[PDB]
């Protein structure tokens, strides 16, 4: 990796939701749902080199 960055639900400048989205992301991450959704989409065909 060249740098380290990250995504994020963008809210307008001073919205009251960014302190409620932050809670509702940290809740999903400890429950393992942010990994459960990523394994549902980013897998696809698990390409081998098989040979």
């Amino acid at each position: 990796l060249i740098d380290s960055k990250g995504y994020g639900v963008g809210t307008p400048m001073g919205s009251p939701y960014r302190d409620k989205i932050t809670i509702a992301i940290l809740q999903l991450q400890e429950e393992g749902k942010l990994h459960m959704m990523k394994e549902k989409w980013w897998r696809g065909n698990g390409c081998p080199e098989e040979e």
Binding site: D3, V9, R18
Partner: protein, 101 residues
């Protein structure tokens, strides 16, 4: 409706709707950009323009946290980590090695 879409950031937005409690209208951004301050005058494009102008409430999309976007909108705290990396073809040849023995 909202039933037109699928994917990661649609399944994320369902889970944010269940926990916090709201209804949501997923609207495609009209520009097709995300955010870019045009250096000739200074103006935003895409989603970051539609959050400064308060035409949106959330921006659930691959909207990477950068230094310049954070001074004009407020991001949440990351739902996915990453970095810039090089994409290139696999080399489809084999090393001959005639002295392989």
């Amino acid at each position: 409706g909202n039933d037109r879409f699928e994917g990661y950031c649609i399944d994320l937005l369902r889970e944010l709707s269940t926990i916090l409690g709201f209804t949501y209208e997923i609207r495609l951004v009209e520009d097709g950009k995300y955010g870019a301050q045009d250096d000739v005058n200074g103006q935003w494009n895409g989603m970051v323009r539609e959050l400064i102008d308060h035409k949106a409430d959330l921006a659930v999309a691959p909207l990477a946290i950068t230094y310049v976007r954070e001074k004009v909108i407020d991001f949440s705290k990351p739902f996915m980590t990453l970095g810039i990396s090089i994409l290139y073809r696999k080399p489809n040849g084999t090393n001959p090695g005639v002295f392989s023995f």
